[PDB]
């Protein structure tokens, strides 16, 4: 038996999957619309069986407030994306009354092979139907740090996609352009493997920051001419400028790592 | 047996020049500074003393410099000796720089084509080397044979600046990727090491790279139907708050945030991240 809170795109995908493996799923929402046992209140859903999955951790505190009374005995798995510190404040608040997972998966991928979920009380932890489990510490907010990090790299990628598509829209359609992007991103995703190595040791040895700078300026000039915003690339430019100024004129794009603090 | 004449001996024009030698060509070479950027005729190259001597060295001319300004500057040389030649400018630049050059050089009897080298120097000659070419397709067809030694040719229009548009676009998406890598690494370094972290990033980016295929489709038709911009916004705010707490800069993500804020405000609260395409324009 499990009892879910939050029936958005992700909490439903999760709830649906627990059903397909024949579980006793209890479910709750602010605004109900289910397909399961429906918890009329948060108290009735707390006493049902606990996989929370909401908009923020504020919503976690807000919703579970009323149910101060029956927390004693339960094992709260918060899948809600958030900060490490939010997660630690919640873990201490809830352990005072008797974990965390970053779902590295879109809803459609839940139950799929490529689904993955990243911390907290390892007694309670010791889910697998949903995705490939990956525990990594008794630190209640370690999963959240790894969530946000991975998302940071995602959001880099989408920022490039959007800029790249936008910049070419006039001349060709986006799909016919994926014929060139998708391989190229593949190449460039490889080059980041041979950059984490540099970052881990401290090489940064030369495709030089001086020429890339005059390159990035050609994208900005070209973006304005195509009526596209180059605001996706500005931080990259600001960081390469810190680098050549600080002496890395002839060093690799790895060198910027020390200028992002 | 087949003769080429290069201009510009930086990291890229040397890689190119070196490769033409390894396929036993009659490679002529030129630079601003020869005594600087090596003119090792040792591997067989012929040093053009002036731009004129390098223009007359061959009828295939592969330029590759810092900017197009350097292209115009160097070839100025009252370019009367240009009639008959096939100028391949691999110099990264704007579509409009490329069109201004193509008209300038076609006025002097030459036949211009332009190329975005989608390849670092070490990749030149390799399987994954790729070069986009646009410009006079008459000139490109004749010299497609020779150029093919360097990378996989990919022609796409008689528009002298189409290769440059595709160059800068692809680079824009590269720079997005590195911006995410650096931010993502940075944010995690002080809890776990960058290499052990590529074990999670590299697959995940693979997933997310697939999702961009089914997003170009949306962008091409006009769906944007829901993974919603309202929740991602409170997500992106958690990365900014988390970055400050780890003493890391969240400056890589700010434009994304500014764009999602334009989107939910303009009504796309429940739409997919595809919807943002119309808010970069
Ligand atoms: N979708 C993805 O691709 C994806 C992937 C990985 C992780 N995630 C994570 O999943 C979390 C939820 O996923 P989602 O995509 O399902 O977002 P979602 O559909 O918006 O989930 C939000 C849920 O929380 C409830 N809620 C919203 N505001 C509330 C409030 N003020 N008080 C109480 N309850 C509230 C909603 O129900 P009511 O509106 O009825 O209250 C809704 O069911 C996200 O924050 C994100 O961390 C999403
Ligand atoms: N390396 C890569 O990863 C890569 C990848 C794709 C495309 N590219 C492009 O290939 C081209 C060259 O790249 P690179 O890495 O060789 O650049 P680099 O490291 O700066 O090479 C500099 C080259 O530009 C010349 N130059 C500078 N100012 C000039 C002027 N006023 N007149 C004539 N020549 C001038 C230099 O001459 P000196 O010898 O006197 O400096 C030298 O030939 C650029 O357009 C670059 O954007 C490079």
XYZ file of C-alpha atoms and ligand atoms in Angstrom:
638
model
C 0.000 0.000 0.000
C 1.193 3.572 -0.920
C -0.498 7.036 -0.546
C 0.381 9.752 -3.154
C 0.090 13.586 -2.829
C 0.010 15.727 -6.035
C -1.623 14.538 -9.306
C 0.137 16.768 -11.870
C 1.851 15.414 -15.041
C 4.458 13.553 -12.868
C 2.400 12.430 -9.794
C -0.150 10.769 -12.188
C 2.527 9.010 -14.347
C 3.914 7.702 -10.987
C 0.393 6.811 -9.655
C -0.602 5.125 -13.005
C 2.598 2.957 -12.879
C 2.017 1.766 -9.246
C -1.435 0.587 -10.554
C 0.101 -1.353 -13.539
C 2.170 -3.326 -10.881
C -1.093 -3.941 -8.897
C -0.388 -1.806 -5.728
C -2.943 -0.414 -3.187
C -2.524 3.277 -4.351
C -4.217 6.001 -2.188
C -4.230 9.468 -3.940
C -4.813 13.183 -3.032
C -4.730 16.629 -4.780
C -5.821 20.260 -4.110
C -8.208 19.841 -7.116
C -9.194 16.154 -7.646
C -9.672 14.484 -11.070
C -8.327 10.892 -10.642
C -8.976 7.594 -12.570
C -7.128 4.144 -6.646
C -8.482 5.302 -3.210
C -9.264 9.109 -3.164
C -8.097 10.801 0.120
C -10.821 13.438 0.906
C -8.319 15.409 3.084
C -4.500 15.314 3.627
C -5.205 13.529 7.013
C -7.213 10.702 5.273
C -4.310 10.365 2.743
C -1.673 10.385 5.566
C -3.586 7.541 7.394
C -4.151 5.684 4.039
C -0.589 4.177 4.110
C 4.004 8.168 1.226
C 5.226 9.396 -2.237
C 4.768 13.245 -2.374
C 5.290 14.978 -5.801
C 4.132 18.662 -6.066
C 5.113 22.118 -7.586
C 7.524 23.194 -4.767
C 8.380 22.209 -1.133
C 6.221 25.205 0.002
C 3.189 23.178 -1.321
C 4.595 20.136 0.639
C 4.585 22.105 3.991
C 1.308 23.940 3.087
C -0.670 20.718 2.232
C 0.687 18.498 5.105
C 0.217 21.349 7.705
C -3.334 20.279 8.844
C -1.958 16.685 9.324
C 0.528 17.633 12.127
C -1.200 14.828 14.244
C -0.632 11.506 12.247
C 2.973 11.583 10.854
C 4.385 9.072 13.463
C 5.455 5.810 11.695
C 5.252 6.914 8.002
C 8.153 6.974 5.409
C 7.885 10.268 3.389
C 9.548 10.129 -0.129
C 9.470 13.721 -1.528
C 10.102 13.619 -5.322
C 9.378 17.418 -5.441
C 12.302 19.168 -7.235
C 13.882 21.803 -4.912
C 17.096 23.045 -3.181
C 19.343 20.840 -0.978
C 18.552 23.262 1.942
C 14.735 23.089 1.403
C 15.152 19.243 1.542
C 17.270 19.302 4.781
C 14.834 21.785 6.495
C 11.898 19.416 5.558
C 13.841 16.229 6.612
C 14.539 17.710 10.121
C 10.955 19.166 10.400
C 9.304 15.756 9.526
C 11.765 13.513 11.532
C 10.856 15.768 14.561
C 7.226 14.478 14.123
C 8.118 10.722 13.849
C 14.086 11.243 2.088
C 14.418 12.882 -1.380
C 14.408 11.801 -5.045
C 15.223 13.774 -8.209
C 13.121 12.079 -10.961
C 15.591 12.245 -13.908
C 12.663 11.320 -16.258
C 9.771 13.058 -18.125
C 6.340 11.487 -17.368
C 6.184 9.287 -20.558
C 9.650 7.790 -19.621
C 8.395 6.662 -16.150
C 8.369 2.797 -16.176
C 10.723 2.911 -19.267
C 14.356 1.602 -19.283
C 15.917 5.154 -19.516
C 13.897 6.404 -16.466
C 16.298 7.248 -13.548
C 15.714 8.634 -9.977
C 18.507 9.834 -7.580
C 19.306 10.576 -0.629
C 18.040 10.603 3.013
C 17.471 8.032 5.832
C 18.953 4.839 4.259
C 16.916 2.611 6.702
C 13.647 3.915 5.083
C 15.118 3.807 1.502
C 16.258 0.127 1.820
C 10.325 2.454 -6.112
C 12.198 0.234 -8.676
C 8.999 -0.231 -10.853
C 9.174 3.525 -11.789
C 12.866 3.855 -12.890
C 16.521 2.777 -12.235
C 17.120 3.659 -8.497
C 20.553 5.309 -7.661
C 21.085 6.006 -3.874
C 23.950 8.437 -2.922
C 24.124 9.423 0.790
C 22.395 9.950 4.200
C 22.456 13.723 3.291
C 18.698 14.547 2.809
C 19.504 17.134 0.028
C 22.200 15.346 -2.112
C 19.609 14.021 -4.691
C 18.295 17.653 -5.086
C 21.857 19.026 -5.724
C 22.361 16.311 -8.431
C 18.811 16.956 -9.808
C 19.456 20.736 -10.257
C 23.015 20.163 -11.637
C 21.716 17.732 -14.346
C 18.784 20.153 -15.138
C 21.401 23.026 -15.381
C 23.034 21.014 -18.282
C 19.636 20.218 -19.841
C 18.705 23.956 -19.767
C 22.097 24.755 -21.373
C 21.164 22.318 -24.203
C 17.594 23.735 -24.760
C 19.061 27.307 -24.683
C 21.371 26.247 -27.549
C 18.586 24.373 -29.457
C 16.151 27.390 -29.223
C 18.937 29.880 -30.216
C 20.176 27.541 -33.055
C 16.611 26.826 -34.405
C 15.528 30.530 -34.096
C 18.735 31.658 -35.942
C 17.992 29.340 -38.944
C 14.079 29.471 -39.071
C 14.209 32.071 -41.947
C 16.344 29.795 -44.216
C 15.091 26.241 -43.292
C 12.574 24.378 -41.056
C 13.613 23.044 -37.596
C 13.122 19.268 -38.381
C 15.262 19.279 -41.645
C 17.823 21.226 -39.439
C 17.930 18.401 -36.750
C 19.703 16.451 -39.604
C 22.700 18.807 -38.804
C 22.060 19.708 -35.090
C 21.514 16.166 -33.601
C 24.813 14.676 -34.924
C 26.770 17.934 -34.153
C 25.384 18.024 -30.541
C 26.479 14.325 -30.337
C 30.061 15.337 -31.361
C 30.070 18.334 -28.924
C 28.578 16.136 -26.097
C 31.665 13.830 -26.592
C 34.064 16.878 -26.390
C 32.558 17.649 -22.892
C 33.826 14.180 -21.682
C 37.397 15.187 -22.681
C 36.753 18.507 -20.817
C 35.529 17.106 -17.425
C 38.960 15.272 -17.451
C 40.811 18.649 -17.871
C 38.495 20.230 -15.174
C 39.283 17.260 -12.805
C 43.141 17.432 -13.227
C 43.849 21.099 -14.269
C 45.219 21.033 -17.897
C 43.265 23.709 -19.938
C 45.877 23.183 -22.763
C 44.975 24.112 -26.417
C 40.473 26.205 -30.948
C 41.539 29.093 -28.616
C 39.427 31.492 -26.360
C 40.669 34.570 -28.378
C 39.203 33.238 -31.718
C 36.016 31.785 -30.065
C 35.393 35.344 -28.649
C 35.437 36.891 -32.198
C 33.289 33.867 -33.221
C 30.634 34.410 -30.465
C 30.590 38.118 -31.616
C 29.733 36.878 -35.198
C 26.701 34.895 -33.721
C 25.472 38.066 -31.815
C 25.858 40.263 -34.993
C 24.123 37.458 -37.074
C 21.262 37.025 -34.489
C 20.442 40.820 -34.543
C 20.447 40.691 -38.414
C 17.927 37.737 -38.334
C 15.796 39.635 -35.717
C 16.766 36.897 -33.099
C 17.877 37.563 -29.442
C 21.522 36.519 -28.690
C 20.788 36.715 -24.898
C 21.380 32.889 -24.601
C 25.116 33.351 -25.538
C 25.907 36.584 -23.525
C 26.962 34.789 -20.273
C 29.299 32.544 -22.348
C 30.828 35.788 -23.839
C 31.082 37.488 -20.383
C 32.921 34.334 -19.084
C 35.370 34.035 -22.088
C 36.120 37.821 -21.643
C 36.970 37.210 -17.908
C 39.251 34.367 -19.199
C 41.338 36.061 -21.992
C 41.685 39.201 -19.725
C 42.902 36.863 -16.882
C 45.490 35.432 -19.351
C 43.719 32.357 -20.930
C 43.806 33.847 -24.502
C 45.362 30.646 -25.928
C 43.726 28.116 -23.503
C 40.731 25.731 -24.116
C 37.044 26.479 -23.218
C 37.685 24.167 -20.156
C 39.659 27.080 -18.560
C 36.362 29.001 -17.892
C 35.530 26.479 -15.059
C 37.438 28.649 -12.473
C 35.596 31.874 -13.604
C 32.002 30.553 -12.949
C 32.394 31.071 -9.134
C 49.856 16.289 -59.164
C 46.929 18.422 -57.753
C 47.906 21.986 -56.578
C 46.263 24.069 -53.748
C 47.318 27.469 -52.215
C 46.336 28.227 -48.561
C 46.107 31.657 -46.773
C 46.240 31.807 -42.921
C 48.409 29.392 -40.857
C 46.709 29.426 -37.439
C 45.487 26.257 -35.620
C 42.980 25.537 -38.482
C 44.849 26.606 -41.677
C 47.875 24.438 -40.581
C 45.687 21.347 -39.813
C 44.218 21.896 -43.337
C 47.708 22.537 -44.907
C 49.253 19.498 -43.084
C 46.406 17.229 -44.417
C 46.812 18.335 -48.093
C 50.504 17.272 -47.678
C 49.618 13.804 -46.185
C 47.566 13.187 -49.446
C 50.663 14.274 -51.488
C 49.340 17.575 -53.034
C 51.393 20.577 -54.340
C 50.435 22.739 -51.243
C 51.336 26.498 -51.472
C 51.025 28.422 -48.126
C 50.905 32.107 -46.936
C 50.532 34.006 -43.592
C 50.889 37.559 -42.162
C 53.827 36.164 -40.087
C 55.761 33.196 -41.621
C 58.740 33.450 -39.156
C 55.850 33.232 -36.574
C 53.253 30.587 -37.754
C 55.828 28.054 -39.108
C 56.485 27.865 -42.898
C 58.121 24.371 -42.568
C 58.594 23.689 -46.281
C 60.161 20.658 -44.434
C 56.894 18.677 -44.982
C 56.944 19.905 -48.651
C 54.833 23.152 -48.587
C 55.824 26.151 -50.837
C 55.896 29.582 -49.018
C 54.068 32.418 -50.937
C 56.234 35.549 -50.223
C 53.208 37.832 -50.956
C 49.411 37.300 -51.396
C 49.969 37.742 -55.225
C 52.570 34.862 -55.314
C 50.072 32.710 -53.296
C 47.153 33.691 -55.636
C 49.269 32.633 -58.722
C 50.481 29.451 -56.879
C 47.188 27.586 -57.695
C 43.583 27.883 -59.103
C 42.113 26.308 -55.897
C 42.565 28.840 -53.030
C 41.492 27.789 -49.471
C 41.495 30.963 -47.240
C 41.105 30.445 -43.417
C 41.822 33.504 -41.120
C 40.613 35.390 -37.921
C 37.725 37.331 -39.598
C 36.529 38.363 -43.112
C 38.170 41.797 -42.510
C 41.559 39.929 -42.685
C 40.243 38.220 -45.915
C 39.568 41.653 -47.622
C 42.715 43.230 -46.035
C 45.142 40.455 -47.214
C 43.654 39.945 -50.746
C 43.378 43.776 -51.363
C 46.731 43.808 -53.287
C 44.854 45.462 -56.241
C 43.400 41.935 -56.785
C 43.780 42.048 -60.643
C 45.461 38.533 -60.683
C 42.173 36.895 -59.384
C 40.569 36.109 -62.838
C 39.986 32.298 -63.149
C 40.579 31.225 -59.489
C 38.125 29.344 -57.129
C 38.177 31.070 -53.662
C 36.985 28.781 -50.754
C 36.764 31.054 -47.621
C 36.453 28.804 -44.525
C 36.700 31.937 -42.261
C 33.774 31.825 -39.760
C 31.613 34.978 -40.112
C 28.128 36.473 -40.755
C 25.962 35.639 -43.823
C 26.248 39.362 -44.839
C 30.093 39.462 -44.495
C 30.086 36.345 -46.801
C 27.717 37.946 -49.409
C 29.768 41.238 -49.417
C 32.977 39.121 -50.048
C 31.238 36.914 -52.715
C 30.106 40.026 -54.716
C 33.523 41.792 -54.187
C 35.512 38.716 -55.486
C 33.068 37.721 -58.340
C 33.511 41.376 -59.574
C 37.256 40.482 -60.070
C 36.652 37.342 -62.217
C 36.922 34.670 -59.450
C 34.086 32.266 -58.401
C 33.360 32.326 -54.640
C 32.142 29.591 -52.215
C 32.050 29.703 -48.372
C 32.315 26.991 -45.715
C 31.626 26.503 -42.027
C 34.263 23.963 -40.835
C 32.141 21.958 -38.330
C 35.448 20.410 -37.054
C 38.225 21.264 -34.532
C 41.764 21.052 -36.026
C 42.542 17.486 -34.691
C 39.273 16.215 -36.364
C 40.372 17.507 -39.825
C 40.858 14.415 -42.077
C 38.839 12.328 -39.495
C 35.450 10.602 -40.188
C 33.409 13.074 -37.991
C 34.940 16.157 -39.743
C 32.142 18.064 -41.599
C 32.103 21.345 -43.646
C 28.891 23.155 -44.825
C 29.381 24.940 -48.227
C 27.246 27.567 -50.038
C 28.120 29.833 -53.034
C 28.733 29.299 -56.810
C 27.822 25.576 -57.228
C 29.810 25.454 -60.567
C 33.066 26.167 -58.592
C 32.079 23.837 -55.669
C 31.383 20.827 -57.993
C 34.868 20.997 -59.689
C 36.753 21.329 -56.324
C 34.452 18.903 -54.337
C 37.040 16.159 -55.166
C 40.094 17.880 -53.558
C 38.239 19.493 -50.526
C 36.757 16.012 -49.642
C 40.212 15.030 -48.127
C 39.533 17.461 -45.185
C 35.981 16.407 -44.117
C 32.490 15.257 -45.314
C 31.292 18.012 -47.777
C 27.572 19.149 -47.427
C 26.477 21.777 -50.076
C 23.205 23.731 -49.358
C 22.443 26.654 -51.749
C 23.749 29.259 -54.285
C 23.322 31.821 -51.405
C 26.973 32.803 -50.561
C 26.141 33.182 -46.784
C 23.914 30.083 -46.069
C 26.912 27.986 -44.751
C 27.760 30.899 -42.329
C 24.119 31.036 -41.016
C 24.283 27.224 -40.384
C 27.832 27.547 -38.903
C 26.746 30.207 -36.327
C 23.425 28.380 -35.564
C 25.266 25.076 -34.806
C 27.913 26.990 -32.709
C 24.988 28.747 -30.842
C 23.775 25.212 -29.771
C 27.327 24.038 -28.948
C 27.795 27.138 -26.710
C 24.401 26.386 -25.080
C 25.692 22.837 -24.303
C 29.094 23.953 -22.824
C 27.234 26.667 -20.785
C 25.078 23.883 -19.270
C 28.095 21.521 -18.763
C 30.167 24.271 -16.957
C 27.109 25.356 -14.832
C 26.177 21.668 -14.083
C 29.824 20.626 -13.263
C 30.487 23.823 -11.182
C 27.223 23.268 -9.194
C 28.264 19.671 -8.242
C 32.164 19.804 -8.045
C 32.062 20.509 -4.244
C 30.023 17.309 -3.508
C 31.199 14.805 -6.251
C 33.842 14.696 -9.053
C 33.139 15.888 -12.661
C 34.113 12.563 -14.433
C 31.936 10.297 -12.125
C 29.163 12.947 -12.845
C 29.442 12.504 -16.707
C 28.078 8.966 -15.919
C 24.742 10.829 -15.166
C 25.040 13.937 -17.459
C 26.071 12.255 -20.793
C 23.130 9.760 -20.881
C 20.636 12.449 -19.617
C 21.829 14.923 -22.350
C 21.310 11.975 -24.811
C 17.648 11.631 -23.602
C 17.112 15.458 -23.754
C 18.817 15.627 -27.231
C 16.107 13.122 -28.436
C 13.307 15.316 -26.906
C 14.599 18.265 -29.090
C 13.758 16.168 -32.253
C 10.092 16.000 -31.110
C 10.349 19.790 -30.415
C 11.649 20.936 -33.871
C 8.429 19.155 -35.123
C 6.250 21.335 -32.784
C 8.301 24.471 -33.814
C 7.771 23.558 -37.542
C 3.931 23.030 -37.283
C 2.854 25.164 -34.236
C 1.574 22.799 -31.450
C 3.327 23.832 -28.131
C 0.907 21.402 -26.297
C 1.947 20.015 -22.824
C 6.276 19.284 -18.296
C 4.844 22.858 -18.046
C 6.550 26.356 -18.150
C 4.978 27.271 -14.720
C 6.711 24.320 -12.888
C 10.011 24.642 -14.864
C 10.098 28.366 -13.750
C 9.949 27.345 -10.022
C 12.568 24.700 -10.967
C 14.977 27.232 -12.627
C 14.497 29.396 -9.450
C 15.686 26.375 -7.332
C 18.904 26.149 -9.515
C 19.617 29.945 -9.034
C 19.006 29.711 -5.215
C 21.160 26.466 -5.100
C 24.000 28.029 -7.221
C 24.280 31.096 -4.869
C 24.357 28.697 -1.823
C 27.252 26.676 -3.463
C 29.056 30.011 -4.287
C 28.468 29.243 -8.084
C 27.263 31.831 -10.716
C 23.732 31.178 -12.137
C 24.423 33.667 -15.018
C 24.248 30.797 -17.611
C 20.513 30.164 -16.785
C 19.284 33.838 -16.430
C 18.341 34.347 -20.131
C 16.376 31.027 -20.037
C 14.526 32.391 -16.895
C 13.870 35.823 -18.516
C 12.426 33.955 -21.599
C 10.151 31.540 -19.574
C 8.878 34.637 -17.590
C 7.989 36.399 -20.933
C 6.160 33.112 -21.836
C 3.956 32.441 -18.729
C 3.128 36.231 -18.562
C 2.131 36.049 -22.312
C -0.165 33.082 -21.407
C 2.044 29.946 -22.001
C 1.902 28.840 -18.298
C 0.708 25.327 -19.302
C 2.579 25.060 -22.669
C 5.807 23.099 -23.513
C 9.352 24.633 -23.613
C 8.850 24.621 -27.474
C 6.547 27.688 -26.994
C 9.623 29.890 -26.145
C 10.702 29.807 -29.861
C 8.400 32.860 -30.569
C 9.874 34.841 -27.573
C 13.530 34.875 -28.847
C 12.433 36.749 -32.062
N 6.982 16.935 -16.162
C 8.276 16.635 -16.242
O 8.768 16.441 -17.363
C 9.051 16.443 -14.949
C 10.143 15.603 -14.935
C 10.833 15.391 -13.775
C 10.412 15.986 -12.598
N 9.364 16.814 -12.603
C 8.944 17.427 -11.310
O 7.565 17.141 -10.951
C 7.054 18.122 -10.077
C 5.564 17.991 -10.362
O 5.522 17.560 -11.737
P 4.442 18.065 -12.862
O 5.106 18.128 -14.228
O 3.336 17.055 -12.648
O 3.957 19.491 -12.449
P 2.412 19.725 -12.177
O 1.524 18.968 -13.157
O 2.161 21.231 -12.039
O 2.345 19.198 -10.663
C 1.851 20.084 -9.650
C 0.855 19.368 -8.751
O 0.843 20.049 -7.493
C -0.430 20.579 -7.159
N -0.308 21.992 -6.734
C 0.066 23.037 -7.507
N 0.059 24.206 -6.786
C -0.322 23.920 -5.523
C -0.538 24.691 -4.266
N -0.345 26.032 -4.215
N -0.929 23.994 -3.166
C -1.120 22.641 -3.199
N -0.958 21.880 -4.312
C -0.556 22.449 -5.487
C -1.255 20.452 -8.410
O -2.591 20.107 -8.118
P -3.641 21.327 -7.862
O -3.386 22.340 -8.972
O -5.019 20.722 -7.947
O -3.291 21.838 -6.475
C -0.548 19.447 -9.299
O -1.158 18.176 -9.302
C 7.721 19.391 -10.608
O 7.797 20.460 -9.634
C 9.064 18.909 -11.072
O 9.822 19.014 -9.900
C 8.669 17.016 -13.742
N 40.255 25.881 -34.222
C 38.963 25.537 -34.203
O 38.505 24.826 -33.300
C 38.067 26.050 -35.291
C 36.890 25.349 -35.582
C 36.042 25.812 -36.598
C 36.370 27.004 -37.291
N 37.500 27.695 -36.986
C 37.784 28.924 -37.745
O 38.936 28.854 -38.635
C 39.505 30.184 -38.714
C 40.894 30.279 -38.092
O 40.880 29.674 -36.802
P 42.285 29.512 -36.026
O 41.868 28.756 -34.750
O 43.247 29.167 -37.158
O 42.499 31.046 -35.496
P 43.804 31.659 -34.748
O 44.290 30.656 -33.624
O 43.732 33.088 -34.249
O 44.512 31.720 -36.182
C 44.815 33.036 -36.514
C 44.964 33.153 -38.017
O 44.326 34.376 -38.482
C 45.320 35.240 -39.088
N 45.039 36.714 -39.019
C 44.673 37.467 -37.948
N 44.512 38.778 -38.281
C 44.741 38.853 -39.607
C 44.769 39.939 -40.599
N 44.466 41.215 -40.179
N 45.100 39.612 -41.893
C 45.395 38.352 -42.275
N 45.427 37.327 -41.393
C 45.113 37.521 -40.086
C 46.554 34.812 -38.313
O 47.755 35.345 -38.828
P 48.966 35.442 -37.765
O 49.595 34.046 -38.166
O 49.801 36.695 -38.010
O 48.214 35.641 -36.436
C 46.402 33.328 -38.418
O 46.383 32.910 -39.798
C 38.610 31.115 -37.888
O 37.581 31.754 -38.708
C 38.040 30.150 -36.887
O 36.898 30.859 -36.504
C 38.351 27.234 -36.007
